[PDB]
Design a protein around this ligand. Structure first.
Ligand SMILES: NC(=O)c1ccc(S(=O)(=O)N(Cc2ccc(C(F)(F)F)cc2)[C@H]2CNC[C@@H]2NCc2ccc(C(F)(F)F)cc2)cc1
Ligand SMILES: [Cl-]
Ligand SMILES: [Cl-]
Ligand SMILES: [Cl-]
Lengths: 99, 99
């Protein structure tokens, strides 16, 4: 699809057997999801931006379905105000910016 | 152009006659630039980031060129990790997400 930017580019994703709404975010290096359970090992990480930093759990090799495109990669889990699909997964679905 | 996301989508902007580096950020509603002098009056604005909300200065109808594309619009000034070109100007220059 082609998604314009008049409003936030929210899409439905499937992760850990749950459906969630997430923002396609070219400014985010990493994918960050609200508190949820994921399988496997994790390690702590700090991420930040305007407003400050939050602590998240880093899970690797997690599968996510984004608009019917399956991708695998690292997912950070923590108290983010919005679910964010970052570049590490956007690349995998072939997402580009065009103008 | 078409910009992939394997690295940060950093571009050159021109504002106040000066060249600066900025991030094309579809996850940002607004355009936020590091401290600099802009003309005219400003209004208060609260923007929410990953780690909380902060106050920034809102300037309207500011001339700004983004990757050679001329735009005129709202620019916020405040403590941001990098200069951010958000949806308000991405929309102006005709930028879309595609996959
Ligand atoms: N309203 C508005 O315009 C606005 C809203 C939010 C922000 S934001 O929170 O600062 N912000 C932009 C951002 C840009 C660049 C950087 C930095 F360079 F440091 F990596 C950090 C943050 C948000 C907006 N889009 C990307 C970033 N998302 C939160 C985030 C932060 C860090 C990660 C990580 F590190 F895991 F990848 C993942 C997600 C900026 C502007
Ligand atoms: Cl990854
Ligand atoms: Cl104020
Ligand atoms: Cl604007």
């Amino acid at each position: 699809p082609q998604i314009t930017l008049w409003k936030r580019p929210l899409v439905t994703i499937k992760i850990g057997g749950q459906l969630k709404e997430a923002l396609l975010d070219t400014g985010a290096d990493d994918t960050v999801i609200e508190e949820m359970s994921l399988p496997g090992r994790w390690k702590p990480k700090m991420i930040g931006g305007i407003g400050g930093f939050i602590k998240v759990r880093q899970y690797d090799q997690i599968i996510i379905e984004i608009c019917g495109h399956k991708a695998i990669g690292t997912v950070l889990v923590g108290p983010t105000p919005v679910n964010i699909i970052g570049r590490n997964l956007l690349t995998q679905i072939g997402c580009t910016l065009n103008f």
